[model samples]
Target: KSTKILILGAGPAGFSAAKAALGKCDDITMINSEKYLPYYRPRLNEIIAKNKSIDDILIKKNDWYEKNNIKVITSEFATSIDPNNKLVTLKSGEKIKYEKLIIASGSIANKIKVPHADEIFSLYSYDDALKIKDECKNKGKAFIIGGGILGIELAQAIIDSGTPASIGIILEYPLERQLDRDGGLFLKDKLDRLGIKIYTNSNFEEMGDLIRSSCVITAVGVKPNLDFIKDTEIASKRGILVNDHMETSIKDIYACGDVAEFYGKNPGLINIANKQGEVAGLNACGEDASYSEIIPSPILKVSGISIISCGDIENNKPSKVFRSTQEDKYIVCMLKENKIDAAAVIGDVSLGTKLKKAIDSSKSFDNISSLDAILNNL
Candidate 1:
C-alpha cells in the first residue's frame, strides 16, 4: 500500500489523480489556491451566461471528499517544491512531506502586453468570470481580445449576458489553429450569423480606431503555471517534462496537465489533462500505467456551434478532401493511403466520437462512398 499521496493543484489533472490514488494510497491529500473545490473550469462560461452557479460547476460535491476521506486544503498554494526531501513548501511556511507527489499545477492565462497596446483582462478563474459577469451589468460595450475558441465562446456568453461583445483577432478568422482557412472562414460566417462582432486583422494597439468598449475581456490563451517549481530540480523544459508513466525525473514525483510536458508537448485540453492525471495517479501508487500521445481533438463548446477537429486537418501532400455543403460546413479529411489520418468537421457533431476514433486508429476510409456512408461506417 502506498503511503502519503500528495497532489498539488486541484484542476482536472490534480482531482483525477487524487481520486485514482484513493484506492491505492491511504493518506490522500489535495491542495489548491482556490477557496472552492475543483470545478468544471471548461464550463465556467456557464457562470458568465448566468445559467450555472458556483455549486453547479463544482467537479464534486463537498460530501464527495468527506465520504472518500480525502483531505483538501483550499485557499493555499505551494511556494516551492522540495523534491530531494519529498516535501512541498506551502506559502504558509509549512513543509508537507509525501511519499508520493503529483504535480498537476495546470496553467494561467496569458495577458500579452504589446507596444502601446493595453493588456485588458483574462478569465482563467471563477473570480475572473464573476468579474466579467458583474462588469456586464454596468459596462457599456463589451469587447474580447483573441479569436480562438474561448474568445469566441466568451463573446457569445457576454452576448447571452445582454452585453454585445465584439471580437478582435490577429488572424483573418477565428479558430485558425484548429481549422484550415476555409473551415475557419466558415466558422466566421456562422459567428457573424450568430450576431458576434468580428474584427479581423485587428490592431489591438490603443484599440486601433476601435469603438469605446466599457468592458474588455482577454481569452488570448494560457501558459504553464510552473512558477512554484522554479527552485526545484524537477527537470522542466517548456514545462515539467515527464515520461510515459507521467513520472518526472525524480523517482516518486509525477507531473501532469498543462504544467507537464509529455515529450515537450502540452496540449492544454481537458481530455489530455484527465488522461495524464489518471496515469500519474496509478503509477504513483506503484501501479504500472503508460500514457500515449493524444492528437489534439477539441470540440467547439463556447462558440455554440458544432465544430470538432481531429489530428492534422490539412496535409501539404495529396489528400482526399470531403466536405459538407449542407450549410457551408467543411469536412476536410486528409486520408493518407486510404486511411483517415487527419480531419476537420463542422455541424452538430453526430460523428464527433466516430470522427475522433477514425483519426485516432488510422481507420480505413477506402470503402466509404458518400458522407452518409462515412458517417455510418466511421
Candidate 2:
C-alpha cells in the first residue's frame, strides 16, 4: 500500500514532520534507523556531563508513536531511494512507496579522516555518548579539539568528571566562528579563566596512537551522507540541496534538517535544524511557507556556565559595542552596520531574555556607540 507521506529518519526534523502531518494526512508512515522516538540530541553531551542515562535524553516515548497512528520502523537503514518512481528500499529488504517524501536523515560526526573517523570512541550517536561516558575515568587529561560549541561543552563535561584535562580549541582565524573577532577574543579570555586552555590560530597537528597521552575529542563539523543519492537525480553539496519550500531538485521529494543544504549555507545548529524541519513538514503537507529570518544564534554551556549569542556578528549595521568584566567573566554586545549584530554573556545568564529580545527586534541600537556606554548597561 502507498502512503500519502513518508518521512526518512526519526530525528528532530523527521519526528516533527510526522507529528505535524499526523491526523492531517490519512496515510503517513515514518521510518527511523533508531528504535526509539525522537529525542533531544543536543543534550547528548549534557547527558555525559551530568552522568545521566539514555532514558533521560529521550524526547518522546515509544507510546507516543502508537498514539499518533504513525508507523515507526527502527534499526533498518534506507539503502536506496528512488524519487523518480517515489520508492525507498530498506536494508531489511522492504520496499515502500510514497506520494510525498521528506528526507530528514540527520548528520554524523566528522572524524580525523586520516584514520579511524568511525572508531569506537567517537561520540556522535546517543549510544556513542553512552560508550564515552562509560569509558571515561576521572582525573585524566582529555584533549578537546574544535573551539566550536560541541568541543566547549564536552570539554567542560570531561573537567567536571574530576579529570585534570585541557581544552584546546583550534582555529585558523580566531575563536568561535559564530561570534565576531572581539566577541571570540572575549570568549577565549573567559574560557581561560575557567581553567580551560584556549588555542587560537593553531593548525591541526597530529593525533598519535597515544590514547593515554592525550585523548583528542574532535568536534569540528558534520557532512551529509548522500551516498543513497549518488546515482539519483538529487543535487547535493556536502548535503542534499533544497529550496525555500524544502523541495529538492526532483519534485515531490524534499529534504530537511542537518542533511539539507539550503541557499548555499548549512545551518547545522540544533535550533536551525528544528525550525527548518517544521518549515519542511508544513510545506510537505501542501502549505506554502518560506524559510526566512533565521538569525545566527550560538549557545555555549560549560561547567555550569551557560552563555548565548544571537544575530550577525560582522554585518549588523549602525551597530554598537559593549563590554563588562567581573568575577572572571566577560560580556559583550556588538552593534554595527545598523542592528545589534551580536551579544554575549559568559559567566552570567541574567541578560538572556533581554539580549535575545534585542536580537529578535532586528532594530539598530545605534545610540550606544561607545564600548564604555554599552558596558554600563550590564
Candidate 3:
C-alpha cells in the first residue's frame, strides 16, 4: 500500500484533498504553482472592486499546513506524470514518488485568438485580480468582452471603482447559455441601471469601439489546464474524464474540480469542486466514497440582484414550464413523467433551494397542481 500521497495543484480542490487525506496517509505533499497559499478564487471580483483584500479571501495560511503536517511545495510546476512508475517530475528536475496522486490542476481562463489578445486581461488568479485592480485604479473607460457571469461581475467591479464608464459587448444575449432570452433581457436591464452600457448582438463596427479602449477584460470562459498531462494515459476531451469514484484512467491517479468531467457534466462551481475533492480524497485514503452528482446551480453576486439557475433551465422540451411574477422575479422548471428535472430561479433564492432539495431527493412536485401553488407554498 502507498503511504505517501501527492496532490498536484493547490486550488480549492487540492486543499480539500489534503484536508481529507490527513491522518489517513503517513505523508501528504501538495504542489502548487502559485507562491501563496490557496485562496478563495470566486471572490477575486470582490478584490478588484475593493470590497475585499488579499488577506480576506485566503482559505488557509502557511501555518495551517505546518500544523496539519502537510508538506506544501509552492512556486513549483509539475512538468510530467509517469503512471507506470508512479512518479511526477517537477520543473526543477525533482522527482516525487507517490502511492496515490490527486490532480487538481484546475482550469485556465480561455482567451480569444484575435489581434491585441495579449493586451487583454483574463482574471483567473490572485495576480490577475491585482493587475485588474491596478488597472481600475487608473480610472479610464473600460471595455469588457463576454456576457457570462464572470464578465458581468468584472464589469460591475470596474464600475464600483468609480470609473467614468464601462461597456460590455456580448455576442449574444447576456448569459444566453445560462439563462433564457427573457431572463437575459431582465439581467441586461438591471445591469444597465447600474450604469453599465451593454451592447447585445454586437458586430465588428461596435467591436471597434470596444477594441479602442485601453482597458479590456475577457471573461468569455475557461477550459481545463491539462498541458502537463498530454503525455500521460489520462483520458481527456474538454476535461479529464473520471468515474463516480473520481478515478482517472490510470490506477491510483484521480482528478477533481474543473479538471474533472463526470457524467457528461462539466462543473465549474466552487461547491461542486469541493465535493469532488472530498470524494476523491476519501477514496484515495482507503475510504469508500463516491461522487454521484451535485445540483448544478449558479448564483450571481450582483450589487442588488439575486440570481440562481439550476439544471436544464434552458431546455425546450414539452415538459418545460416558465413563470415570472410582476416583481420581475422568474422561475423555470422542467418536468418529465411527473418529476422535477431542472429549475431556474431569479430574485428569490429560497424557492431555488426548495426546488434543488426536491430534485435531489427525486421527490416529484406532481402533488402540487400549478407552478404558482408550488411557488406560493414552497
User: What is the C-alpha local distance difference test score of each model?
Assistant: 0.80, 0.70, 0.78
Q: Highest lDDT: which candidate? A: 1
Q: After superposition, how far is residue 115 of candidate 3 from its true place, in Å?
A: 5.0
Clashes by residue pair, model 3: none
Candidate achieving the largest TM-score: 3
Regions of candidate 1 where Cα sits further than 4 Å from its true position: 1-3, 114-119, 206-212, 293-298, 302-304, 314-328, 335-341, 348-358, 363-378
Worst 10 residues of 3 by lDDT: 163-172
| lDDT per residue (tens digit) for residues 261-321 in model 3 | 9987776889878888888899999897999776545478875777877656565463646
For model 2, the superposed segments whose C-alpha errors exceed 4 Å read: 113-120, 138-141, 172-174, 180-185, 199-211, 289-291, 294-298, 310-369, 372-378
Off by over 4 Å in 3: 1-3, 114-118, 164-167, 296-298, 334-341, 357-378
lDDT order of candidates, top first = 1, 3, 2
lDDT of 1: 0.80
RMSD of 2: 4.0
State the displacement of the C-alpha of residue 164, model 2, in Å, after optimal TM-score superposition: 4.0
- Candidates 1 and 3 compared by lDDT, better number: 1
